[PDB]
Symmetry: C3
Subunit: 306 residues, 3 copies
Amino acid sequence: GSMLELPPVASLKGKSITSAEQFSRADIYALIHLASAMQRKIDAGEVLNLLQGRIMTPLFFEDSSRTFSSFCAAMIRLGGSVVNFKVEASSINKGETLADTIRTLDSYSDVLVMRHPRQDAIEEALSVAQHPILNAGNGAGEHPTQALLDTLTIHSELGSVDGITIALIGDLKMGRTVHSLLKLLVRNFSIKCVFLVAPDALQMPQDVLEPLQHEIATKGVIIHRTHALTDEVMQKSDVLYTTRLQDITIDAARMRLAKEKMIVMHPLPRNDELSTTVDADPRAAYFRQMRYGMFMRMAILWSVLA
Amino acid sequence: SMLELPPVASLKGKSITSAEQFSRADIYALIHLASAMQRKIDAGEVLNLLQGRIMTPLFFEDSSRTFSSFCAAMIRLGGSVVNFKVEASSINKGETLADTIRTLDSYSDVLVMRHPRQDAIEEALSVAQHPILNAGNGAGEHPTQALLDTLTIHSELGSVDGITIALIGDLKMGRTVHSLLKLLVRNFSIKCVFLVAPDALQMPQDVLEPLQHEIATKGVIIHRTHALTDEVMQKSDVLYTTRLQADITIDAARMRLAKEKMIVMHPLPRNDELSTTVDADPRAAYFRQMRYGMFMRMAILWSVLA
Amino acid sequence: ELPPVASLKGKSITSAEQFSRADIYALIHLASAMQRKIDAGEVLNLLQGRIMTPLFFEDSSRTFSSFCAAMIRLGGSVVNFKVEASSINKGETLADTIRTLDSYSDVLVMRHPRQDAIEEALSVAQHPILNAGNGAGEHPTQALLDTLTIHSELGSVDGITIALIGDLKMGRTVHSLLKLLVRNFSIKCVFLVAPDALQMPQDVLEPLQHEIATKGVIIHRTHALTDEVMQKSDVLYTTRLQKERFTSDDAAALQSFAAKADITIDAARMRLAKEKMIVMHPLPRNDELSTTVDADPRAAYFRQMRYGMFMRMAILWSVLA
Ligand SMILES: N[C@@H](CC(=O)O)C(=O)O
Ligand SMILES: N[C@@H](CC(=O)O)C(=O)O
Ligand SMILES: N[C@@H](CC(=O)O)C(=O)O
């Protein structure tokens, strides 16, 4: 993988990342090819020193296993460093405001990775930070880097993103991952069809679907709402993208209905909506998805900080 | 390297426990080293001075600035951090402080220690082979805060001799003001100090009494006030305020009385004693102060470890 | 100058049993070489771009810090994963957690209160896992650094008389150490010094019974540091009461440590010890090992931690080379 270039995606330079809306099709493909090259070099055991002396600081005001770790791992595999700030062992116990906390980490860091239970917290953070903030999840709003890594996953596993039928399953109302993913897919690709699979109370919100209306109509994207993984959903979907609470269960029995050429995805963590009986299936892409996450995050950090 | 970033020789291999241990020449050499670190980092240069050396933080109480600042400064020097947490440690199995110290001392080149007991630093020093840097010992001292505070004054105003400074808030329990008063009065010709606090929270007699010889021979003027009077507002070149862990609040209305060229400083975190209405004022130096902190800690770490 | 121990390459470390004598000596010599270079101030860049992720489900000072420090001094990096701040709060299983960190890491360092958690991790992990403690089971890298300590301090492991003292029932350190010494060395004598309720378990001794017999290793049980134990032992290896592993059963076991044994090591007790010997303790200690011993040249339990770092460098390099 030695002779591969790592050209940073120029449109990302020095910018905060808050929404799937900010990326073009050209941006997404450029990040995919960058991530794929990162992967090749890392897997061949090559050592990258692109971000030596640059600091990422995680600011996680709620729990994370993969997003936090993969961001740290991505930064370190670029040669960068991480300052391990913790909210519970911080001056927030002494009454410190969110804005003062941002200005603090912003004094030391080159990039901030922020996850917060309030949707409006990223906005507040942007209004005071000088360095880029990467949105690692803002309440029930968005998770833009999850959308990007999810798209890398589809592209690598199936070989194409245009033309797919995808089911978004579970808690679509509160799921920030399905919010960013729908936006990123519909805005930039020629999606055939989207099944919105959720109980009525947990359906995809209007504030996501409405801004997409022009794109949905002009590209002819077929939207279908169901409250179950029906035979039709199982038989037509190239991607079953399921999510946690926050019948739609996927187990081996259910998988007998799926196409040979398809993938099951889940941003994780999972509960019983996605059974361990699916794990040995070649079509279970939800573990590989995490490793794709680290490479996408390397492509993003290098592009942001180059 | 020895030209651009000469280490301050007097600090080599030494523990830092008190503002008292520094001379005027030490402070100026640190200040000049910190500005050179600043210039190199802000120009994007990568420093490799402490590769292979380990700092370990030992924080028995919370910190946002001091912990992060020290970690960043170590990293920006090319050194590394072992992220020890007291709450996830063998202290829960009955391990003493002395044994904890010997433990981290077996792996580390420098320890950074914050503890709610004033004498805990002295116990740690009796067993440690490697330097310990006091990041706060009860209501005792915070010597690196006084150093970065003095760098902040020097950089913003252009000199430290001749200033009128107000120390405002909980002066009794404020380890920052204890160290700062000591550092300033011992080593500079301070014109006037205002100690702005009710008698119940006034500067301790055990800080004032040992400064007797320097107050006398440099003719430093010192007055107590209970409130932030108009005289204090009009005469002060530096308003240094702190968390009362009446009538001491600095807001945009109070600022209308301040000199045109002065700074407002605060070691942080703040409560209502320092209104956010002041944050847009160019005189508000308490965010820049944190960044000076990182460069001062780089100058300290490099001098101690070179 | 720092050749990795080839037999360890790419392999998980779960038990003292997986090591041969040649493996132990090659690790010791590699560890001593790491120590010479680190002490001379040399900077190593052997694992640049490799990541270790600590997965600690219980408390640690030495083991966690030592592994991180060892990784760093090899030029490697750490992803500081925190169990209490993870998706485990949202219901994520152990296996899914393992798969997660395994997606980003080159090596996992795992400590868990359940003895069988390490095996479950192994069945799903692609990258090597290092057992940093599995319940009251084993602490294999402790056993290695302890043998490094005995070797460096006394100059020989074969022929020693060793007392294993304290909570032998819940002591994963003495479990691993007893297995490592007996399988790979000609130990002259082992004193098992504990109250009956905390004695070395049968599931440790029985698999060792063949080696004990055919090597002629003397095993004695006592509940006290008698004159005989003090006068004959080349090493006194003492341990903490493992309270966190402990009903009236529990209460009986817990108080037996002071009530049904006489096993404190203090300066007065040390007046009976040989001139050429060491006192060891994996740490942390409570009152079983008095601070009056710390000034004694024979107190090796602080130097033991530093040997720990060098053994862990030799191990990490050997696993990841
Ligand atoms: N972990 C993802 C989805 C989930 O929580 O299941 C998120 O934080 O958005
Ligand atoms: N945080 C600083 C100052 C303050 O608490 O106001 C200290 O810990 O000393
Ligand atoms: N720290 C060692 C010994 C002890 O805990 O007492 C262990 O974890 O096994």
